[PDB]
Structures are given as structure tokens and as C-alpha cells.
Amino acid sequence: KTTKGVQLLRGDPKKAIVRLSIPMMIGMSVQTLYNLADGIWVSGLGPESLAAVGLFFPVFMGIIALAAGLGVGTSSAIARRIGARDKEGADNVAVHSLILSLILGVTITITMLPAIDSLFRSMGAKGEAVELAIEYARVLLAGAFIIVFNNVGNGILRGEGDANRAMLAMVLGSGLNIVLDPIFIYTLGFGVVGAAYATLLSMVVTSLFIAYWLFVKRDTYVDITLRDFSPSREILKDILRVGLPSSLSQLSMSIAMFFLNSVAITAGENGVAVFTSAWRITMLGIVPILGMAAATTSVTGAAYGERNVEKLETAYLYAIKIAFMIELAVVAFIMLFAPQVAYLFTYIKGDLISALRTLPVFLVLTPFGMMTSAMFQGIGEGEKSLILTIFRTLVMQVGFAYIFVHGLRGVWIGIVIGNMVAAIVGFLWGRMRISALKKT
């Protein structure tokens, strides 16, 4: 009763950080490749089609943050349980999250569906021009449970060191979505709604794999059954203690990017075009970090389960090192090949280079405050990972951008310095928790 992933988790923290992060970074990246595909197919459809997607953006990101957040709590809870050699607890978190996926998932469907037609009118939609917005959001919400179930299944797997089969789910989902996108949109001639049916149908297949894995094959470490089910008030508090603040965190990172564009619109439209494009390019370097963060949580949780800080500190500190040296390469590439990177994303070329030479430099500082939030979720304290994210993106990143604006260079100058301070605050606070554990 011990799989390969468990032996990684219950082993050398340095070995665990790497061999879990790589397939995660892969999985995180292959799905980003989809967003670029679906990004270029939808573009050619016309002005009217992009207006339905952009309106269906908050509801999508809203139910992605929820699904992913619940998965983070699941991943962290199972990881901590397995670290403490508690199978009976680990098996019981897997079942608890599966029921929560049903509750959270379907509720998202039945709550949003009757409210989706007023959402558009509230924003000021015409009724015929944005009549696709309701049709696009209808298809996605019809699988809002599948999205959550997929995330939970992914959270269950990476929570027991099974990042390889977790990667498979991310690839199979993005791959099918990639091949069905041109067929549904263009070949079958469904238009923008075809992209929704492609995403829907692809997630169904992923769940079929996920279900086959932990319901049919059952070749996973944990045992999933209801035969002697014990509804726990503690496991429920556990998953939500990380999950709920995780959902708000993923929202806050993008709910602050709006204010950054507001400081770009105030300093106007030609400036917002420069900011948005430069931001999209620079933010691509976050994808490798996200994998490291997903791997950090899994290993600092197992170390917290094994109750030894030297392992928890090693994995969390090793995580920063690799993420530092990964961004070191990324930043250099973007700064050196700036005109080359601009050409592909601009089909304002001069103002973009002025950004892509200064702005991306904050990517190097990021891993400090990010691995800390990751291990904060690893030990189970998500409320601290949330308040550190609020401090970073909304308080410092935005606050400095407004302090410099009251030209356009002050926007990147605010984002960098604001994220520089937040990294310093984040790393120190992460260190303090370690010493507090060493004294516990």
C-alpha cells in the first residue's frame, strides 16, 4: 500500500521538489498553449464574437478560481495526512473533496444559469449583439461541475505525489480542446459557441479518465469508498481553510490588473494597448512558477505531516532557488530578444520595447513571495497566503503605480518596486513561520 509518488513525498525534499514540479510546469504550460490557440481562432471570427468571450471572462475566471481553489485545499490536506502516515485520514479527505466537488460544482450551475441573462443587461448589453454571451456561458456552466470534479481529481493526485498522472489530465484536456477547437468553430461552423462545446466535450473526456482512475482502476494510493463514511467537521474546515482563501487569491491577482489598466488609461487608450500586451507577455513567465508552487504545497505539507521543519524549510527554500534561476533565464530572453518578442504580439512597437526592457525585471523577485504563499498553503494556513497576495498585487503593485503616475514608465516602475518590496516582506514572513515551527 505505497505508490511511487508517496515514496517521493516521503523522501528527499530536493528530489521531491523537482520530480513533481516538472510535470506540473509541463501541464500548466500545455494548457496555456490552448489559450493561445483559442485566442487566435476566436480573433478572426469578428468584433461581435470577441464581445461575448470578454463578457464571459469574469464568470469563467470566477468558476476557475473556485474549482482550482477547492483543489488546492484538497491537495494540501491529503499531502499533510500522508506525511503523518495517516491513511484513514488521507482516504477520507479524498471522499470529502469528491462530495464538495458535487456541491460546489452543481451549485455554480444552478445559481449562475438564471442570473446569466441579467449579468449582461446589467453591464449594458444590447440583446442581439451580445446574445452569444448567454449562449457561450450556458454551455460552460453546463459543465461547471465537471470542471470542479476535474480539479479535485487533479488535487487528489498531486496530493499523493502522483503529478505524472496529474500531468496526463492537463495534457489530455488541453489536447482534445486544441483539436476540437478548429473543428467545432470552423469545420462544423458553430462559431464562438463551438469553442464552448469544444471545452465542454474535452473536459467530459478528462473526467472519464479521472473517474476511470480513482473509481474503476483504483490504482491510486488512497481508498475511495462510502461504505463506512464519516462526515468530518474537521476535514471540512481543513479543505476550506486553504480552499476559500485560495479562490479569493486567484481572483485578487486579476482583480488588481484592472486597476493597473485604469492607471494606464489615466496616463490613455494608446497606453492601455501597450500595457495589456506587455503584461500578457511578461505574465507568461509565471506559468513555470505556478508548477513550482503546486509542487511546493505538496512537499511542505508532507514535511508538515512528518513534523520536521528541516525538510519543510529545505523544500521551500529549494523551490525559490529553481524558480529564481528559471525566471533569470526568462527575463534575459525577453530583454535581449525584445524586438523579436514584440513582433509576434504586435502583428506602438517602440513603447512596447520600453516596457519589455524594464517591466519584466520584476519576474525575478516574484518567486520569493510566491513560494512562501505556496508553503503557507502547504502547512494549512491559507489565510496568510491570501493576505500576502492582497498585499502584493492590490496594495503594493497598484499603490506604487498610482504613486508614480501622480509618465507611462512610472507604471512599470511602480509594478517592479511594488513587487520588489512585497518579495522582501514575503520572504521574511515565510522565514518567521519556519522559526516558529522550529520552536514548536
Partner: peptide
């Protein structure tokens, strides 16, 4: 993408 985080991070 979907699993996990947000991301996108693209339009």
C-alpha cells in the same frame, strides 16, 4: 487553463 489557478493570463 482550468487546473489550476488563473491563468489566464490571456485576453
Amino acid at each position: 487553463x482550468v487546473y489550476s489557478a488563473v491563468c489566464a493570463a490571456a485576453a
